[PDB]
Amino acid sequence: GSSGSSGYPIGEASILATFTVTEGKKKIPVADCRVQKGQLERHKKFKLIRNGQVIWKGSLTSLKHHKDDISVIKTGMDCGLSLDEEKVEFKPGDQVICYEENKVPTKTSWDPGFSGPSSG
Numbered sequence: 521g522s523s524g525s526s527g528y529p530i531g532e533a534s535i536l537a538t539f540t541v542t543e544g545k546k547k548i549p550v551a552d553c554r555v556q557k558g559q560l561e562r563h564k565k566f567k568l569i570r571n572g573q574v575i576w577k578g579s580l581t582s583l584k585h586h587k588d589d590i591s592v593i594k595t596g597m598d599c600g601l602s603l604d605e606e607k608v609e610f611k612p613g614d615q616v617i618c619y620e621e622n623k624v625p626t627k628t629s630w631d632p633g634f635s636g637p638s639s640g
Contacts, residue, residue: 523574525621531558531595533616538609541602550600551610560593560618566601568608569615576608 533553540549551568560566560583567577580601585593593599601616 524619526624527620527622528625529558529617529619530564531560531618532556533560533593533599533618535610535612535614535616538611548602549606549609550602551614551616552598552600553616554598555593555595557595558618559595559597560599560601560616562591564618564620566616566618568603568610569617570611570613575614576603576605578604 533555535551535553537552538550539552540547542548562580562583565577565579568575581604583593583599583601584590585597585599590599
């Protein structure tokens with residue numbers, strides 16, 4: 521039916537590499553993506569975009585920032601997420617949009633602002 525609820529993307533993450541992991545015996549697939557913009561919150565929903573099409577849609581099952589049970593992933597931070605639907609597969613050419621499903625904001629504020637001088 522309807523693809524994507526009324527809302528907005530919290531942060532976009534691209535998959536640089538993809539691999540699998542072992543836990544006890546099973547083999548859980550993992551996807552390494554580097555937050556290019558925004559952050560990833562271990563709660564919201566996610567989806568894997570490959571070639572522009574979505575393959576998996578929903579919330580992750582687990583998230584880790586390399587030996588560190590974190591919840592939020594800032595920018596420039598590498599983290600690996602795994603989907604419950606092992607069926608789904610990733611690749612170094614997909615996208616991970618972490619949006620919120622509930623409603624849509626109104627956005628009532630417009631004002632630019634930048635800063636980044638040079639030193640040394």
